[PDB]
Write a protein that binds this ligand. Structure first.
Ligand code: XE
Ligand code: XE
Ligand code: XE
Length: 263
């Protein structure tokens, strides 16, 4: 809706930075709203959903099992590992690692999962093979959050990310079981409280994944809808701002409010 696009424009002015935005109808795949749809933004932790999509694709092919247990060492633990730091002795299953990566944004969980698929290059190869020739992961946590201006590493475009997320959640790629699992993990996100969720009326469904990185990078991907069922995909990214986290949160929440208001 035009008023939502105005909020996005206002966010650009107030943050002093680019904002990319897409609204995508879940069923029809029609683009309902867009802004800088073909521009690149760092994915940050939003890549963790694509990562577990690749993992689930391997589970489908029998190349991976959700119950397989991975052990690791203190040396594997990078910054912000709230779940993995608690399981050096017992290890974690692949399912537990995806839950940690998506619901808590656990960085070590993401790196371990990357190792299972062969690293950033293979995540990118996975994306390429499902028809996203735009999105690219090049680095591991936490370096992938560097967000150097004009650097294309570890970036997506709002349009590429939106359509890929749609293909993962509803497309032909994953089995029904794996699509449900991916969405269930996203619905259980615990670290996107002040963003879109903050504008969400009671009874609405939301499954999401947020990200933040260097140089004012912030973003979120989401499938949401009223009446406990998703009906739309929303992607929003920003980078370049010197604004505090709180202001970036509030800008996304404000865009969120307009989306809901004019649903
Ligand atoms: Xe969904
Ligand atoms: Xe934003
Ligand atoms: Xe949003």
């Amino acid at each position: 809706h035009p008023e939502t696009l105005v909020k996005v424009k206002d966010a650009e002015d107030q943050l002093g930075a680019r904002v990319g935005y897409i609204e995508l109808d879940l069923n029809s795949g029609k683009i309902l709203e867009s802004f800088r749809p073909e521009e690149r933004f760092p994915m940050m932790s939003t890549f963790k959903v694509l990562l577990c999509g690749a993992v689930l694709s391997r589970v489908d092919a029998g190349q991976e099992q959700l119950g397989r247990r991975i052990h690791y060492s203190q040396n594997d633990l990078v910054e912000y590992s709230p779940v993995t730091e608690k399981h050096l002795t017992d290890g974690m299953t692949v399912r537990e690692l995806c839950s940690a990566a998506i619901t808590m944004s656990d960085n070590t969980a993401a790196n371990l999962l990357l190792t299972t698929i062969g690293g950033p290059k293979e995540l990118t190869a996975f994306l390429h093979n499902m028809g996203d020739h735009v999105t690219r992961l090049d680095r591991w946590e936490p370096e992938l959050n560097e967000a150097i201006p004009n650097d294309e590493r570890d970036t997506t475009t709002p349009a590429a990310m939106a359509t890929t997320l749609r293909k993962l959640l509803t497309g032909e790629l994953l089995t029904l079981a794996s699509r449900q699992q991916l969405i269930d993990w996203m619905e259980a996100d615990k670290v996107a409280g002040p963003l879109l969720r903050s504008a969400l009326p009671a009874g609405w469904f939301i499954a999401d994944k947020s990200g933040a990185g260097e140089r004012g990078s912030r973003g979120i991907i989401a499938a949401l809808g009223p009446d406990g069922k998703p009906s739309r995909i929303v992607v929003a990214y920003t980078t370049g701002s010197q604004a505090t986290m709180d202001e970036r949160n509030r800008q996304i929440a404000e865009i969120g409010a307009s989306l809901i208001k004019h649903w």
